[PDB]
Amino acid sequence: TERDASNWSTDKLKTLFLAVQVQNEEGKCEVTEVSKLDGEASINNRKGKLIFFYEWSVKLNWTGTSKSGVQYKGHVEIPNLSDENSVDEVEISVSLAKDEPDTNLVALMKEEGVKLLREAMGIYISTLKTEFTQG
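Structure tokens predicted for Activator of 90 kDa heat shock protein ATPase homolog 1:
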């Protein structure tokens, strides 16, 4: 039973989450605050037996402006989903534009925002495992 570097993740995932970038006012995005994956993450033996099964949920929020001239702050929350799979293909609770006239934007955020989270897998998998098994 090996532990996963959880502290390494929050630090990056949270920041990376506060790193949500914006594009055109037509399809822009801006982070407003990130909680962090709260729960228990764990990896199996390392040195070639290293696998990533985590059980935690993260809660964050964002803000995006639409060419329409409206700002909207949606919700993004992924429950106890394990990164044993693609973070992006994971189950995320997205709630943006549904209340505002961005609609088209939330879609892009689907390929950019939840995608950015794809990057979260980039560090979680790389930073944690590369460090734990030390390569």
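Residues 2-133 form a domain with the Bactericidal permeability-increasing protein; domain 1 fold (CATH 3.15.10.20).
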